[PDB]
Amino acid sequence: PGSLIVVGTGIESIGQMTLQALSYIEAASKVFYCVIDPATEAFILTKNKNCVDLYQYYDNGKSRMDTYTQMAELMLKEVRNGLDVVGVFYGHPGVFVNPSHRALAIARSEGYQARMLPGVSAEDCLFADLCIDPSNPGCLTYEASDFLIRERPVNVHSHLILFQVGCVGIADFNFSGFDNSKFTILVDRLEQEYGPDHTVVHYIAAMMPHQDPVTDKFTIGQLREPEIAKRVGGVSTFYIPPKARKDINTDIIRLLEFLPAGKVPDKHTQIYPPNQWEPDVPTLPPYGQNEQAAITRLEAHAPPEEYQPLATSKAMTDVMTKLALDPKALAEYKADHRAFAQSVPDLTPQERAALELGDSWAIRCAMKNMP
Amino acid sequence: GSLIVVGTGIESIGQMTLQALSYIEAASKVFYCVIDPATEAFILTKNKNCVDLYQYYDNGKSRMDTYTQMAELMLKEVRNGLDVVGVFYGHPGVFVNPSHRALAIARSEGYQARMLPGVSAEDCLFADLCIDPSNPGCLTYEASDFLIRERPVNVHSHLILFQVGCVGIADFNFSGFDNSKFTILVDRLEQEYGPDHTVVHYIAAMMPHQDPVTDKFTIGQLREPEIAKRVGGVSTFYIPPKARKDINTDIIRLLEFLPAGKVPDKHTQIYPPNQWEPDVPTLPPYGQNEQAAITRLEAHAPPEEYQPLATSKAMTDVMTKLALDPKALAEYKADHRAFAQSVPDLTPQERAALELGDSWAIRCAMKNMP
Ligand SMILES: Nc1ncnc2c1ncn2[C@@H]1O[C@H](CSCC[C@H](N)C(=O)O)[C@@H](O)[C@H]1O
Numbered sequence: 048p049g050s051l052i053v054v055g056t057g058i059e060s061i062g063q064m065t066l067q068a069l070s071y072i073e074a075a076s077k078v079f080y081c082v083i084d085p086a087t088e089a090f091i092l093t094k095n096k097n098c099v100d101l102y103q104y105y106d107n108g109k110s111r112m113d114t115y116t117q118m119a120e121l122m123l124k125e126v127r128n129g130l131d132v133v134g135v136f137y138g139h140p141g142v143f144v145n146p147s148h149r150a151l152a153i154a155r156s157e158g159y160q161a162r163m164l165p166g167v168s169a170e171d172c173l174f175a176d177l178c179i180d181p182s183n184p185g186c187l188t189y190e191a192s193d194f195l196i197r198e199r200p201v202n203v204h205s206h207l208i209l210f211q212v213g214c215v216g217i218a219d220f221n222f223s224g225f226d227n228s229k230f231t232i233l234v235d236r237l238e239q240e241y242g243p244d245h246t247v248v249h250y251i252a253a254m255m256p257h258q259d260p261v262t263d264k265f266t267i268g269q270l271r272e273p274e275i276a277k278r279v280g281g282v283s284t285f286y287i288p289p290k291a292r293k294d295i296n297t298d299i300i301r302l303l304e305f306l307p308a309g310k311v312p313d314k315h316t317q318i319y320p321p322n323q324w325e326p327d328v329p330t331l332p333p334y335g336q337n338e339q340a341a342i343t344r345l346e347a348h349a350p351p352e353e354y355q356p357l358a359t360s361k362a363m364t365d366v367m368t369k370l371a372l373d374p375k376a377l378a379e380y381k382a383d384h385r386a387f388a389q390s391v392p393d394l395t396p397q398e399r400a401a402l403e404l405g406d407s408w409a410i411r412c413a414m415k416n417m418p
Numbered sequence: 419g420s421l422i423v424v425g426t427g428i429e430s431i432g433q434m435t436l437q438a439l440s441y442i443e444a445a446s447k448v449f450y451c452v453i454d455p456a457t458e459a460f461i462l463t464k465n466k467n468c469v470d471l472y473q474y475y476d477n478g479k480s481r482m483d484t485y486t487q488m489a490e491l492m493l494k495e496v497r498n499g500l501d502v503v504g505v506f507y508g509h510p511g512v513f514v515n516p517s518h519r520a521l522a523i524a525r526s527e528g529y530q531a532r533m534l535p536g537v538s539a540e541d542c543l544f545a546d547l548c549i550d551p552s553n554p555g556c557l558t559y560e561a562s563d564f565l566i567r568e569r570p571v572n573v574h575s576h577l578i579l580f581q582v583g584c585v586g587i588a589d590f591n592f593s594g595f596d597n598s599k600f601t602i603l604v605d606r607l608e609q610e611y612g613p614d615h616t617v618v619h620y621i622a623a624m625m626p627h628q629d630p631v632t633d634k635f636t637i638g639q640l641r642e643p644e645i646a647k648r649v650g651g652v653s654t655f656y657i658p659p660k661a662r663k664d665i666n667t668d669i670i671r672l673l674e675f676l677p678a679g680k681v682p683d684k685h686t687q688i689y690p691p692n693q694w695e696p697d698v699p700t701l702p703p704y705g706q707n708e709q710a711a712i713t714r715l716e717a718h719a720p721p722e723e724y725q726p727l728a729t730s731k732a733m734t735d736v737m738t739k740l741a742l743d744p745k746a747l748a749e750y751k752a753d754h755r756a757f758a759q760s761v762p763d764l765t766p767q768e769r770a771a772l773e774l775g776d777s778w779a780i781r782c783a784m785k786n787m788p
């Protein structure tokens with residue numbers, strides 16, 4: 048009896064909140080939120096009548112871990128009283144967020160329903176604004192101070208993302224912001240691992256819908272310029288592109304049959320597109336001889352035989368939207384599949400049967416058939 | 419012409435962001451690639467002009483040709499002056515080839531190009547497994563690329579592998595992938611981690627009533643034919659740290675982290691522990707430092723420097739519209755004053771902040787009036 052759901056709000060105000068985060072806000076018994084955008088906070092207050100701002104539990108000179116302990120306990124206290132508590136943290140609520148993990152784990156240890164819903168993180172915004180794929184060529188993400196304290200290894204051939212570069216070695220809080228006086232220690236490490244000429248991108252996603260992202264391209268040595276290091280604050284994130292590209296192992300690529308068997312891959316060339324923040328890698332052009340061949344093959348393209356297009360009804364689309372947008376209806380459906388199933392209007396006989404089964408394959412067959 | 423690329427999250431409908439939906443509705447043309455029928459059934463009700471990109475896959479047809487065709491279908495509409503919005507499930511730029519190719523070409527030729535972030539499978543992995551990438555760092559690889567280019571592991575940090583069910587397959591089949599080189603991946607993981615180390619097979623729920631797959635195996639167990647069978651196209655591996663890295667005490671004092679009279683714990687991590695990691699010396703939840711912080715809550719008042727929100731409903735609604743209505747945002751960015759002077763019931767300070775547009779002015783207008 049009593050539960051704790053933790054949701055996120057994304058980074059950019061309001062717009063980056065997920066539909067299910069909003070739905071679990073409204074259905075909550077009490078809301079504890081920690082956001083750093085005024086419109087987002089106002090947006091949370093109009094969707095639930097019982098909200099407490101967790102930001103007030105920071106204080107000047109007060110340890111952040113002590114604030115995190117208090118933030119977790121304020122939620123767990125309402126949980127142990129049998130309330131349905133929803134915790135709110137901007138971005139992804141479990142990405143570089145201490146009190147959410149502490150509160151959910153303690154509630155689990157005491158036998159309560161606990162669950163975190165994912166959200167859009169600052170790393171997600173970084174991928175989008177910088178148009179980089181973590182797949183190419185791998186992504187490593189560190190907390191900036193932990194990266195120094197435990198001397199975590201770099202991967203100069205993959206992406207590097209550093210959070211909290213604006214509070215290096217700071218366990219305190221100050222409403223005015225951080226005095227990043229240990230920033231030079233981080234610069235010393237980045238220079239030692241990458242050299243002073245390598246690129247570092249100072250990233251700050253736009254928090255308001257009309258603002259532009261900060262995507263400023265520096266070298267690591269330029270971070271020692273006073274006017275540069277003052278620009279990084281509490282919502283600053285560093286992206287360091289790969290310094291070089293690792294070679295393909297032709298022996299392993301023949302074992303995996305990535306390329307056609309008989310050919311030797313290109314040793315100094317990546318496939319299009321290039322990373323615009325990366326030192327120049329020889330990259331193939333967008334429209335080679337293999338590319339236009341597939342583009343001109345579009346002239347003779349027909350829907351494949353095994354391609355099965357969507358073929359559902361208005362009633363089936365509405366009931367699955369409801370299961371995704373209505374936590375009240377979802378809780379009833381999981382409690383009794385058939386009693387919920389025969390209650391939905393206008394469902395075709397197979398649609399009622401598929402929804403009563405609930406299996407992924409039955410629901411997909413019901414939405415791909417239709418007489 | 420322009421190209422806006424958005425995502426839908428992993429779990430159907432519910433994990434779409436509010437701004438992804440608004441750019442769907444306001445779009446002239448929509449090209450989508452989702453793998454959930456209800457989500458696809460959610461999209462076509464929001465825009466009358468959609469094309470399913472999934473049809474450009476084919477049996478025996480190279481994925482790279484499809485990605486070239488997927489990007490070209492959007493690009494040739496962009497060169498014709500329409501406002502195109504491409505849709506890919508999850509985060510549209512996380513392990514997605516055609517989205518980046520189309521945006522790069524669109525940029526190179528001078529068109530407006532923007533990607534909106536979405537909720538990825540890695541985001542869902544963080545939530546369902548309830549782990550934090552900060553503790554102790556997170557390394558993400560494409561499974562085959564991790565093998566082909568012999569990428570280094572980091573046994574002290576998180577490891578996440580995408581596409582473990584498609585090891586080395588460049589082709590497509592509607593029946594899915596024949597993960598016949600999966601044993602090459604298992605060989606590498608055992609060499610780096612040992613056969614007894616944990617690997618979590620993760621499949622986020624795609625439907626609202628499903629529960630996630632969070633199966634705890636050992637790397638050696640992956641060789642069991644009935645284990646290798648259950649990893650497919652939407653499978654992701656999580657590998658917890660094999661050990662924790664030591665704190666460098668010299669670096670600790672360079673940073674002046676703790677009081678220069680107190681010495682921190684050298685071989686104990688903070689609560690909570692990673693429930694998927696081999697047992698690490700972990701602090702209890704309610705130590706005396708925590709209990710001291712609990713009892714100090716009784717004497718809590720809002721600090722003097724704390725500035726609570728103090729706004730109006732007219733101001734709340736205009737910023738909601740700017741975030742939820744892309745056409746009003748385009749108007750406002752084109753002329754702040756014309757937009758600011760046109761919104762009704764705005765306090766004169768509120769219109770002045772809106773006309774400025776600066777973050778400092780908007781935040782002052784929303785926290786100031788007593
Ligand atoms: N608007 C923004 N742009 C870039 N990074 C940001 C950001 N807001 C917060 N961050 C990063 O996140 C750190 C705070 S911890 C909070 C992170 C949040 N839970 C998330 O999902 O990202 C900051 O030190 C900064 O590195």
Ligand SMILES: Nc1ncnc2c1ncn2[C@@H]1O[C@H](CSCC[C@H](N)C(=O)O)[C@@H](O)[C@H]1O
Pocket residue numbers: 428506507508509510511512513514537538539540579580581582583620621622623624651652653654
């Ligand atoms: N439901 C799911 N659960 C776990 N991993 C998933 C998943 N769906 C997709 N993936 C991962 O994503 C890969 C496809 S590439 C598509 C990724 C998507 N853009 C995203 O944001 O995550 C798969 O190989 C799998 O590793």
